[PDB]
């Protein structure tokens, strides 16, 4: 009684998560009718991006109430594009419910969520959906055992003439059939009894083996009570030693409430994870929905709260005059919150994702769940469409990054572009759409390549600056030798004190400044050693400015005599692709001026290692799917700069010259 559970519902895209969530909200009476993803009427999927793309872009909270018990279910995204929200939902929960389609089995997205849950130390339960589409549940159980390990079948499917109509609860040897979401007990079919019995024996044995007390009794032949077995089961799941497998479909309305009862029976309470104590909470996500302002979503891990209470935070006291539990986009006021609750805090402009809140002694890192977000690796250059957009862009981006810290916004020092980094093509599309929701039209372009320049031969010469302005003049005289080198180097080789040492810093500054814009095509210059070997000064007119200029003039003159050449960045490209698709991958890489370094095999898959010019793969992320039938994956990492083939170089050099 009064039990509470916090659970993240994760799984590969399209595994039936939101549909199950809708069914749970409907069956518990939280809403009048079960909405549908295909009609845009679900509680979770309410933002324009979620509905347009028919996928959960943003985690939705479903605060389920059932017979006085509460399950705060976090309906999370399926696509890796939304890793931010997925990891945030897992961070916020005490267990993971992993949806697996009976048609597809464990998919890449299933494994990703499973792994994150494992690293967080979270118990896991599997719910098998879509069996109505025709799959083999028994083969799926074997596959789950092979891939995930200690699974524990709770349910087996009840069929009538080949049609899936219900559940056989292995433990109790009872069956239930459904007609229009309504359940009635049925008999376990005669032809199924022996198999059902086998599974029951297997389940009993798996549970007994996890408890020293029960294990002792079984070896001796003593009786094991149902109560003892229930407690052992709960304890084993709590420790991640058994993974219950349930069967339910929100589309066919089969096994929905039984799944909720199993969540309560099998998954841990907040007290079982954190113990009792002072309030401990964390902002696991943030929404800045148009016309709503910033709302911070808080998981209360421990403690209890009443309206008017306050929590400490790195930004000072956070008062909560009103407590609200979120249901999708709605905030429902409550009069108390206990550990396990997820709260929605409105007017939360000062509360950011990842912020820890507490009472008493501040927590250290080991006390707060944390799932690191991998850096976004897909860049696009951002451009406001017009005047109105440029004026509104800064604030819209501020809102976008508050809501989604998995994006990275950076001013590319070298090329001058404003870059937005995301986790995939879909991720970036949803960001563009979100900026549009905020009233700003932006366009994405392929980022400019940071070309550079260097020299091929030694050269030397003079840089001199002498002028008089008013009653004070200027004088700088520098002799500079430039030599090709693997890395930058500055050498002071002044002799006889012809230039005082106090001007060394200014001279190096001037060389570095001129090196920012090479003589070949105006790109930063690298790969040279600069030697200052002679020069002169005048006590009166000499200064740092005169020497910075003289040094810059010397650099420009000398680099031009040093046979300058264009360089481009080269990246290491790893591509994982089906064996039958390898030919297209290589064929295409060859057209991208790629250099195959070698290949490895991972099943019918093969890993292709190559080096390719960054300029040939800035949109590789868009082409990979078509080249690998959607099964491919890739990683790009900077390797080194290399001279641009004479043909390309000329055209690039010409382009830069022609305009600018
Ligand atoms: N036949 C059948 N269809 C289902 C079942 N569950 C869900 N669907 C359908 O599967 C499609 C996707 O369902 P969703 O609930 O959006 O799946 P999801 O896991 O939330 O998807 P993402 O949020 O994109 O990761 C929709 O057409 C649902 O109607 C099921 O058990 N049987
Ligand atoms: Mg969904």
TrEMBL record:
<dbReference type="InterPro" id="IPR009022">
    <property type="entry name" value="EFG_III"/>
</dbReference>
<dbReference type="GO" id="GO:0046872">
    <property type="term" value="F:metal ion binding"/>
</dbReference>
<feature type="binding site">
    <location>
        <position position="18"/>
    </location>
    <ligand>
        <name>GTP</name>
    </ligand>
</feature>
<keyword id="KW-0648">Protein biosynthesis</keyword>
<feature type="binding site">
    <location>
        <position position="251"/>
    </location>
    <ligand>
        <name>GTP</name>
    </ligand>
</feature>
<keyword id="KW-0251">Elongation factor</keyword>
<feature type="binding site">
    <location>
        <position position="56"/>
    </location>
    <ligand>
        <name>GTP</name>
    </ligand>
</feature>
<dbReference type="InterPro" id="IPR005225">
    <property type="entry name" value="Small_GTP-bd"/>
</dbReference>
<dbReference type="Pfam" id="PF22042">
    <property type="entry name" value="EF-G_D2"/>
</dbReference>
<dbReference type="InterPro" id="IPR035647">
    <property type="entry name" value="EFG_III/V"/>
</dbReference>
<feature type="binding site">
    <location>
        <position position="249"/>
    </location>
    <ligand>
        <name>GTP</name>
    </ligand>
</feature>
<dbReference type="GO" id="GO:0003746">
    <property type="term" value="F:translation elongation factor activity"/>
</dbReference>
<dbReference type="Pfam" id="PF14492">
    <property type="entry name" value="EFG_III"/>
</dbReference>
<feature type="binding site">
    <location>
        <position position="16"/>
    </location>
    <ligand>
        <name>GTP</name>
    </ligand>
</feature>
<dbReference type="Pfam" id="PF00679">
    <property type="entry name" value="EFG_C"/>
</dbReference>
<feature type="binding site">
    <location>
        <position position="17"/>
    </location>
    <ligand>
        <name>GTP</name>
    </ligand>
</feature>
<feature type="binding site">
    <location>
        <position position="15"/>
    </location>
    <ligand>
        <name>GTP</name>
    </ligand>
</feature>
<dbReference type="Pfam" id="PF00009">
    <property type="entry name" value="GTP_EFTU"/>
</dbReference>
<feature type="binding site">
    <location>
        <position position="14"/>
    </location>
    <ligand>
        <name>GTP</name>
    </ligand>
</feature>
<dbReference type="InterPro" id="IPR035649">
    <property type="entry name" value="EFG_V"/>
</dbReference>
<keyword id="KW-0342">GTP-binding</keyword>
<dbReference type="InterPro" id="IPR005517">
    <property type="entry name" value="Transl_elong_EFG/EF2_IV"/>
</dbReference>
<dbReference type="InterPro" id="IPR041095">
    <property type="entry name" value="EFG_II"/>
</dbReference>
<dbReference type="InterPro" id="IPR000640">
    <property type="entry name" value="EFG_V-like"/>
</dbReference>
<dbReference type="GO" id="GO:0032790">
    <property type="term" value="P:ribosome disassembly"/>
</dbReference>
<feature type="binding site">
    <location>
        <position position="56"/>
    </location>
    <ligand>
        <name>Mg(2+)</name>
    </ligand>
</feature>
<dbReference type="InterPro" id="IPR020568">
    <property type="entry name" value="Ribosomal_Su5_D2-typ_SF"/>
</dbReference>
<keyword id="KW-0547">Nucleotide-binding</keyword>
<feature type="binding site">
    <location>
        <position position="19"/>
    </location>
    <ligand>
        <name>GTP</name>
    </ligand>
</feature>
<feature type="binding site">
    <location>
        <position position="18"/>
    </location>
    <ligand>
        <name>Mg(2+)</name>
    </ligand>
</feature>
<dbReference type="InterPro" id="IPR053905">
    <property type="entry name" value="EF-G-like_DII"/>
</dbReference>
<dbReference type="InterPro" id="IPR009000">
    <property type="entry name" value="Transl_B-barrel_sf"/>
</dbReference>
<dbReference type="InterPro" id="IPR027417">
    <property type="entry name" value="P-loop_NTPase"/>
</dbReference>
<dbReference type="InterPro" id="IPR000795">
    <property type="entry name" value="T_Tr_GTP-bd_dom"/>
</dbReference>
<protein>
    <submittedName>
        <fullName>Elongation factor G (EF-G-2)</fullName>
    </submittedName>
</protein>
<dbReference type="Pfam" id="PF03764">
    <property type="entry name" value="EFG_IV"/>
</dbReference>
<feature type="binding site">
    <location>
        <position position="55"/>
    </location>
    <ligand>
        <name>GTP</name>
    </ligand>
</feature>
<keyword id="KW-0479">Metal-binding</keyword>
<dbReference type="GO" id="GO:0003924">
    <property type="term" value="F:GTPase activity"/>
</dbReference>
<dbReference type="InterPro" id="IPR014721">
    <property type="entry name" value="Ribsml_uS5_D2-typ_fold_subgr"/>
</dbReference>
<feature type="binding site">
    <location>
        <position position="130"/>
    </location>
    <ligand>
        <name>GTP</name>
    </ligand>
</feature>
<dbReference type="InterPro" id="IPR047872">
    <property type="entry name" value="EFG_IV"/>
</dbReference>
């Amino acid at each position: 009684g009064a039990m509470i559970r916090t659970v993240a519902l994760v799984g590969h895209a399209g595994s039936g998560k939101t549909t199950l969530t809708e069914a749970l909200l409907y069956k518990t009476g939280a809403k009048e009718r079960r909405g549908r993803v295909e009609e845009g009427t679900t509680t979770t999927d309410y933002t324009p991006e979620a509905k347009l793309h028919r996928t959960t872009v943003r985690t939705g909270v479903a605060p389920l109430l059932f017979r006085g018990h509460r399950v705060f279910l976090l309906d999370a995204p399926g696509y890796g594009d939304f890793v931010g929200e997925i990891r945030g939902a897992l961070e916020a929960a005490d267990a993971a419910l992993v949806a697996v389609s009976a048609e597809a089995g464990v998919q890449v997205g299933t494994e990703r969520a499973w792994t994150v849950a494992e690293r967080l130390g979270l118990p896991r339960m599997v719910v098998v959906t879509k069996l109505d589409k025709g799959g083999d549940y028994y083969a799926l159980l074997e596959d789950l055992r092979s891939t995930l390990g200690p699974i524990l079948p709770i349910d087996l499917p009840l069929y009538e003439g080949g049609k899936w109509v219900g559940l056989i609860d292995v433990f109790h040897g009872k069956a239930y059939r459904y007609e229009n979401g309504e359940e009635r007990e049925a008999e376990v079919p005669p032809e199924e009894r022996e198999r059902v019995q086998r599974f029951r024996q297997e389940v009993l044995e798996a549970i007994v083996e996890t408890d020293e007390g029960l294990l002792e009794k079984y070896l001796e032949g003593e009786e094991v009570t149902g109560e003892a077995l229930e407690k052992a089961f709960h304890e084993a799941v709590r420790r991640g030693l058994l993974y219950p497998v349930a069967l339910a479909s929100g589309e066919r309305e089969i096994g929905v409430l039984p799944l909720l009862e199993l969540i309560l029976e099998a998954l841990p309470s907040p007290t079982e994870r954190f113990g009792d104590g002072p309030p401990l909470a964390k902002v696991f996500k943030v929404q800045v929905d148009p016309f709503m302002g910033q709302v911070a979503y808080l998981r209360l891990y421990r403690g209890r709260l009443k309206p008017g209470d306050s929590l400490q935070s790195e930004a000072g006291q956070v008062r909560l005059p009103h407590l609200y539990v979120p249901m999708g986009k709605d905030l429902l006021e409550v009069e108390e919150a206990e550990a396990g609750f997820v709260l929605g805090v409105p007017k939360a402009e000062g509360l950011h994702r990842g912020m820890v809140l507490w009472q008493g002694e501040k927590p250290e890192s080991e006390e707060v769940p944390f799932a690191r977000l991998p850096d976004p690796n897909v860049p696009v250059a951002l451009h406001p469409k017009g005047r109105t957009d440029e004026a509104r862009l800064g604030e819209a981006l501020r809102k976008l990054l508050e809501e989604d810290p998995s994006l990275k916004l950076e001013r590319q020092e070298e090329t001058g572009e404003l870059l937005l980094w995301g986790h995939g093509e879909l991720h970036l599309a949803t960001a563009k759409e979100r900026l549009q929701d905020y009233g700003v039209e932006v366009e994405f372009s392929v980022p400019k390549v940071p070309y550079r320049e260097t020299i091929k031969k030694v050269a030397e010469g003079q840089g001199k600056y002498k002028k008089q302005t008013g009653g004070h003049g200027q004088y700088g005289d520098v002799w500079l030798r430039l030599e090709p080198a693997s890395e930058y180097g500055f050498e002071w080789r002044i002799t006889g004190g012809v230039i005082p040492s106090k001007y060394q810093e200014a001279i190096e500054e001037g060389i570095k400044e001129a090196a920012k814009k090479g003589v070949l095509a105006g790109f930063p210059v690298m790969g040279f050693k600069a030697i200052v070997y002679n020069g002169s000064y005048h006590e009166v007119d000499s200064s740092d400015l005169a020497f910075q200029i003289a040094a810059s003039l010397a650099f420009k003159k000398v680099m031009a005599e040093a046979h300058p050449v264009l360089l481009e960045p080269i990246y290491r490209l790893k591509v994982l692709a089906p064996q039958e698709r390898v030919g297209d991958v290589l064929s295409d890489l060859q057209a991208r001026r790629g250099r195959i370094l070698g290949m490895e095999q991972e099943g019918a898959l093969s890993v292709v290692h190559a080096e390719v010019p960054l300029a040939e793969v800035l949109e590789y992320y868009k082409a990979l799917p078509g080249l690998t039938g959607g099964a491919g994956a890739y990683t790009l990492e900077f390797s080194h700069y290399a001279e641009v083939p004479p043909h390309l170089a000329q055209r690039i050099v010409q382009e830069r010259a022609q305009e600018g």
